[PDB]
């Protein structure tokens, strides 16, 4: 459904695997902060 | 039932995914601490 | 009978979810250290 | 397929377990960055 | 269940892992020849 992995890098950046893709970005600060919309895609498949 | 993810950011904040929602807050100090009630909701759905 | 989550806080404390309860304590240093018996309960239920 | 574990060390190295094998490397920086292709194999079996 | 159950770092850079209900720690492996479970410190036996 949602994320397969969700975890932090030691610099404070949030990482997530969603639909076999890897994303990173600063963690959301409120429910009005759409994280996936602004996260950087860093893995297109295989995760 | 319980949490899907439960993990720390490097600044010491506890993060958790519960019923597809993302929460954060200082970790509970004791079993008198209703963490889910006081945690900040930072994502509603999709986690 | 085992743990659902087992992870570190950035200050070096070990956290664990066991039997729906959340526990914390310094990590064990030898197999003679019964960690769960000495760990601090910081959440009863919902984890 | 996919990863079983995917997590950071405090020095910023990404680690991953894929098909019983353990890999490490600097995290991928764009969707053109094939992480598993350049990651260092540090465990063949047992993970 | 197969392989490890948990595999994760402490903030001082030590690798921890749960394997066959036992908890192990050690410096992370350095190559595909490094037999980690043979050299890792057993710090918990049962219940993990
Ligand atoms: C996985 C993800 O980025 N989810 C967010 C959700 O948390 C947030 O509340 C919503 C606001 O419209 O946007 C997205 O759905
Ligand atoms: C997930 C969560 O926040 N659980 C807590 C539990 O840890 C705590 O013991 C109780 C106190 O009344 O409140 C909540 O149930
Ligand atoms: C879990 C574990 O320690 N696995 C290692 C494996 O990574 C390594 O390639 C092999 C070398 O002989 O020894 C062990 O099987
Ligand atoms: C989860 C937990 O605390 N397990 C410990 C185990 O690690 C240790 O080897 C044993 C004997 O001291 O006591 C407990 O079973």
Residue numbers in the entry:
A (entry chain A), B (entry chain B), C (entry chain C), D (entry chain E): 2 to 48
E (entry chain D): 1 to 48
Any passages from the paper?
Pent is a cationic (pI ∼ 8), designed β-propeller pentamer that binds one N-acetyl-d-glucosamine (GlcNAc) per monomer. Pentagonal proteins, which cannot adopt planar tessellations, are good candidates for forming pseudospherical enclosed arrangements such as dodecahedra or icosahedra. Synthetic macrocycles can mediate porous protein assemblies in the solid state, including cage-like structures (e.g., space group F432).14−17 The anionic sulfonato-calix[n]arenes (sclxn) are particularly useful mediators. Here, sclx8 directed the assembly of a pentameric β-propeller into a discrete icosahedral cage, evidenced in solution (i.e., a closed oligomer as opposed to an extended or infinite assembly occurring in the solid state).
Lys33, highly exposed on the Pent vertices, is located close to the 2- and 3-fold symmetry axes of the icosahedral assembly suggesting that the anionic calixarene can glue these sites. A crystal structure of Pent and the C6-symmetric sclx6 provides supporting evidence for this inference. Like the Pent–sclx8 cocrystals, Pent–sclx6 was cocrystallized in 1.2 M ammonium sulfate and 0.1 M sodium malonate pH 7. These crystals diffracted to 1.7 Å resolution, and the structure was solved in space group C2221 with an asymmetric unit comprising one Pent molecule. Four sclx6 ligands are evident in the unbiased electron density map. Adopting the “double partial cone” conformation, sclx6 binds the solvent exposed loop residues 30–34 at three of the Pent subunits. Consistent with our hypothesis, multiple noncovalent bonds are formed between the sulfonato-calixarene and up to 5 residues including Lys33 (and/or Lys22) from two protein subunits of two Pent molecules. The macrocycle position at the pentamer vertex suggests that sclx8 might form similar interactions in assembling the icosahedron. Potential calixarene binding sites were revealed in the Pent–sclx6 crystal structure, obtained under similar conditions.
